[PDB]
Amino acid sequence: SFAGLKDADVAAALAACSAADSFKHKEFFAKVGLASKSLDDVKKAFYVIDQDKSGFIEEDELKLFLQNFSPSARALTDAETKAFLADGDKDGDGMIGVDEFAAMIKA
Ligand SMILES: [Ca+2]
Ligand SMILES: [Ca+2]
Ligand SMILES: [N+]
């Protein structure tokens, strides 16, 4: 479950990436329903994912990305984590900021 999203969508999205290395963030964003949320709602999601409230989603939080949807969900592999980072880190500082997060989700 995730605030603002349908439990059925979140559960199906988690099932869709059950296999190691099958996680594709853009497919996950669409399946879970975040890609269809308003920009304002996408920003809310960001602050939840930013676990230590540093203002940025760092690699360690990216690795445990799925835990925000279910505490028992698997960690992303180092390969999945790095691809996630490479796709969203538009300014090259090694982390994902709120605007980068929103850009990655809204096409
Ligand atoms: Ca953080
Ligand atoms: Ca960045
Ligand atoms: N972090």
Q: Give the distance from CA 105 to its chain's centroid.
A: 9
CB-based pocket (< 6 A), ligand 3: 52, 54, 58, 60-61
Residue spans of alpha helices (H) in 1-107: 7-16, 25-32, 39-49, 59-63, 78-88, 98-105
Method: X-ray
Q: What b/e readout covers 70-106, taking b as 16+ CB neighbours within 10 angstroms?
A: eeebbebeeebbebbbeebbeeeeebbbeebbbebbe
Domain assignment of residue 64, given as a range: 1-107
Residue 83 maps to which CATH number? 1.10.238.10
- Number of structural domains the chain divides into: 1
How many angstroms separate the CA atoms of 15 and 103, rounded?
A: 25
Give, in order, the Cα–Cα distances in Å from 38 to each of 18, 33, 35, 71. Answer: 27, 11, 8, 25
In units of Å, what resolution does this entry have? 1.8
Pairwise CA distance, residues 104 & 53, whole Å? 20
Ligand 3: residue whose CA is nearest its atom 1: 58
